[PDB]
Design a protein around this nucleic acid. Structure first.
Lengths: 52, 66, 46, 212
RNA sequence: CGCUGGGUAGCCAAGUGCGGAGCGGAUAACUGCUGAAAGCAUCUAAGUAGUAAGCCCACCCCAAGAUGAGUGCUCUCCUA
RNA sequence: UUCACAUCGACGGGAAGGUUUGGCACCUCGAUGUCGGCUCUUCGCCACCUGGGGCUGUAGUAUGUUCCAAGGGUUGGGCUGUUCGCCCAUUAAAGCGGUACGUGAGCUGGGUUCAGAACGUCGUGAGACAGUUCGGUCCAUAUCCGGUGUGGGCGUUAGAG
RNA sequence: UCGGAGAGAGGCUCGGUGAAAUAGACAUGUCUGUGAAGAUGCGGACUACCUGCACCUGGACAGAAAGACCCUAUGAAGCU
RNA sequence: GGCCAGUGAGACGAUGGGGGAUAAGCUUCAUCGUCGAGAGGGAAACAGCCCGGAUCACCAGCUAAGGCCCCUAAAUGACCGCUCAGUGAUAAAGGAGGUAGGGGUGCAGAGACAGCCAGGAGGUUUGCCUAGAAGCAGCCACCCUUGAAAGAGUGCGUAAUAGCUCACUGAUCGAGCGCUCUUGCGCCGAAGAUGAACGGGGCUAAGCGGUCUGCCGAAGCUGUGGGAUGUAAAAAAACAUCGGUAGGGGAGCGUUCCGUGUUAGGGAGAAACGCGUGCGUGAGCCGCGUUGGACGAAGCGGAAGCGAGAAUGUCGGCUUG
RNA sequence: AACCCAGAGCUAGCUGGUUCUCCCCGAAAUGCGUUGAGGCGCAGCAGUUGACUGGACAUCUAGGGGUAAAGCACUGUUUCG
RNA sequence: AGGGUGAAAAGAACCCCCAUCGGGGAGUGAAAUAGAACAUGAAACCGUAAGCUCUCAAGCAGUGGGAGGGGGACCAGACC
């Protein structure tokens, strides 16, 4: 939640799961909260492909 | 200046913890220093200015400070 | 006086959290479309 | 905040001034060991308040340490023991360079306040600290002079803080107020003042005008 | 203290001095000043005035262990 | 004198409080020591006085009632174990209560009327009375919290006065 | 009333000797609320640097001592 | 049916009642739910209220009750209305131009409401009483006329009058005004004794009602892997199950002695005592010891003075103060 | 109504206590009776071993009632013409 | 109520501290850490040394995560 809220525009943690299950990503198991700090450019690729 | 008190206090709190950082661990001090200038001109809404009491008390009875 | 105070387990039938909004009782969990089944967890390779 | 600079002097016994009208007044006699030289002024610019810092009791240099005597020789004055300031409103004209102020400023001002260390009485009981009453001396009683009850019952479960117990009574300074001045002596360096100052003859004594 | 008669310095009061001040701030009850929602009115909804032994400050003392640990002045760090 | 609402308010009704007597028997009987007094608190306002005000069948003095206000005060005694209460002299007034009697690991009398005795009454009697009277041991070096004083260490980013 | 002073034996300090009742372990705050309906131990807030010494005893439903009062026992005993 | 136990003090919550005062966390019953014997989550804490039934592991996911400002996980989410009392925890009778509506009924472009101004008179002081009662101390009805309208008067006042004034009508500006029911949320009523004491901070929304989408949220479910019980009578595999007090049944570990046993082993170190990067569901086993110095395993069996944290147990040792 | 010894390890419907592990199952606080009420006997409800059995849970239908509601036709009671 | 140094007292010649008690060397013994309080010696209890760490802190003292630091190491990622 604290990783996603760094965008500034009002994108919450609930909307990341809106467009995390609509775009069919089965069960990343909140280990994107691990590579959200071990690989912040890769979680920027995660979220920037959730947008598209 | 002209900011309401409690929502400013919550958004100062959410940075004073470190819950805007992906390095947030609630057992260490990952937060950030904040500075609040112009504390004399903090807005409040309704009738806080004449009805909200910051009372305190020492240990002995009859010391509750209005 | 003659107004009884509500003691324990009468305090619990009165001051428990009850969601008395007819909208928020109607809510079921969200439904996503079904997906094809995931493949095998591992495979013997010789 | 005081309404003006005061002096400090030592108590030298008590006596009775005979007024020429016929009355007999009990006066305390004040001496002055050395002039109350203004040593250090602290104004609004270089300090958060404004006060005039005087001292007293010129001594031998062996009696006084290096930071003390360095502070006093920063002002270019004599090495002296006692040292106190008076906080005063920002209209002051006081130079810290050896203003040997003379004692004429209190005679027309027939009201003065004094502060001083009262005489200590050590660890005294509740019968004299807080003016309690003693129990029955007889009739089979056993709580002679004792402190009695201390708190209430079960519901506090403790005793209230600031409760009147025995302890060390005297030793702190006190100020008694609006004490009318009397016959100064411009050659005996002695001021009569009708009252009773805190302490035995010998101690320091703040002598500063009133704050009414 | 054998029992009495007085007493300096201490301690004490019954004795001796002093204190309880403020056209300082904001209020509770109340009296109001203009004054609308109903072209009348009304202490109020805008603004605002007198005022309580009550609240705070001023008053006397302690007080930066106020860990938020203050401020100012001054002294001393040398030989291999 | 007219006049429900200056002041009382019948017949009735609605509340708050937990200070009396009660109801339940929920903690405590391998022990929560009752009533009164002394000492010493602290707190509530449902205000006796002191401060401000409204109304008065308030001419003024003194009031009657009521609003705000609990900072401070609320006497000395004869009777009784007395709480309460009566009376005297007053005082601005001599408030009512909570804090397990507020307070017996701070202190003393009547009492859960203990063991002796007597009077009345009850009982055939032993004995008994929410009847009366005389006499009748009350312990204690504070471990911790709490309190009042008073230090020592360390900290206050060099060390101090 | 209305306490006050003084003299001894203690109390305080030092040197010697040196127990006791008690004790689940104690890193043992206040208010307020809850709870077997009176909490340092649970909850929220506030307050408290650590640790001694000397006094005071409000609490630890403090120590004693399987409540003398009340009731139960198909208990015991004295007496009529 | 056979053998063989406990239990027979219950508690609260909903409904049906009696006793009470339709008072009690009160007492007694009847059906049910929970606790008892139930863990977890929500309820600030908190046996009985809601969800829910804990075999175990995972630094797995989806949910129920309940929540999404911060303390504390998730929406300072969206759109309609409401509240201005911090109501948001609280208790009523009753009062109220509070505010947002809703239903009725009555007046207006032939001027509707509010204010100013004008009139409000004649018989008449209706008849009784009183000194006077002239509408105003009261008793009885409580008129008609001019008219634009005036009531034996709406109140004050006067010795009584006189008089001030109103219901009603006339006149100027001008467009909404009454008076009743009613909800929603509010105000007062509403005051306790140690100290905010109502989770806290606080918030005019982060409060209250109506919908829309998602997320957080248990030890629930799902997934991946073990264990055991029942089928079951061998193994494998399958399905169901596996909270538990009083209690019942099944299976095991350990101790000292005895048969094998003058056992294997052991002054090249047995038992003890202390040790583990080992194995078991666990009671425990096995292994290692610069300590110690002579006994004694396992397996297959048997018998107990057989297993310790409780008895104001008890005996020694040693603390606290 | 002494003390010591013995019956006597009196008796106690009372109090405290009763020690290793794992797995499966799992209550009751009710009735009746009691010189009984904090005890006990039986029933109810457990465990285990059986023998007969074919039911449980949903839906429908049929029977007797006299509760809730209702009502004044009986028994009372009551307001008014 | 109080048993067990050794196999054999071979029970410590002599030197030092020194009034003794005791202690250290030396000597006996396989063992003197088997020394007459003498055989294995555990727990409570009292200690001393080494590593890390506590003086703004509310706690049935744990447990889950683990900052920083220390130690040996060999499956150096592991263990305490």
């Amino acid at each position: 939640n604290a990783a996603i809220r760094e965008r500034g525009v009002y994108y919450n943690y609930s909307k990341f799961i809106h467009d995390l299950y609509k775009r069919q990503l089965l069960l990343n198991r909140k280990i994107l909260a691990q590579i959200a700090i071990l690989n912040p450019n890769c979680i920027y690729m995660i979220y920037n492909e959730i947008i598209k | 200046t002209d900011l309401i008190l409690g929502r400013m206090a919550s958004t100062i709190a959410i940075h004073i913890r470190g819950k805007n950082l992906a390095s947030y661990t609630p057992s260490v001090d990952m937060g950030a220093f904040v500075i609040v200038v112009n504390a004399d001109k903090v807005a409040v809404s309704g009738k806080k200015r004449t009805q909200k009491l910051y009372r305190r008390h020492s240990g002995r009875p009859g010391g509750l400070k209005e | 006086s003659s107004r009884p105070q509500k003691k324990g387990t009468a305090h619990h039938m009165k001051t428990r959290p009850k969601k008395t909004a007819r909208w928020d009782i109607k809510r079921g969990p969200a439904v996503y479309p079904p997906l094809p089944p995931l493949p095998a967890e591992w495979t013997i390779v010789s | 905040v005081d309404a003006g600079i005061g002096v400090m002097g030592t108590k030298l016994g008590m006596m009775s001034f005979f007024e020429e009208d016929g009355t007999v007044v009990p006066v305390t006699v004040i001496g002055f060991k050395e002039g109350n030289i203004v040593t250090q002024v602290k104004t609004e610019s270089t300090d958060g308040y404004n006060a005039v810092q005087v001292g007293y009791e010129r001594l031998r240099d062996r009696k006084l340490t290096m930071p003390e005597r360095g502070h006093l020789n920063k002002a270019g004055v004599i090495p002296m023991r006692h040292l106190q300031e008076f906080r005063l409103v920002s209209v002051d004209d006081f130079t810290p360079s050896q203003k040997l102020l003379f004692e004429e400023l209190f005679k027309e001002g027939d009201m003065v306040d004094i502060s001083g260390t009262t005489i200590g009485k050590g660890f005294q009981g509740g019968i004299k600290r807080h003016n309690f009453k003693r129990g029955l001396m007889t009739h089979g009683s056993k709580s002679h002079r004792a402190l009695g009850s201390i708190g209430a019952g079960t519901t506090p479960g403790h005793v209230y803080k600031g409760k009147k117990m025995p302890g060390r009574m005297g030793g702190t300074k006190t100020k008694i107020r609006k004490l009318k001045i009397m016959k100064i002596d411009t050659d005996l360096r002695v001021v009569m003042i009708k009252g009773a100052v805190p302490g035995k003859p010998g101690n320091l004594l703040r002598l500063a005008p009133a704050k009414i």
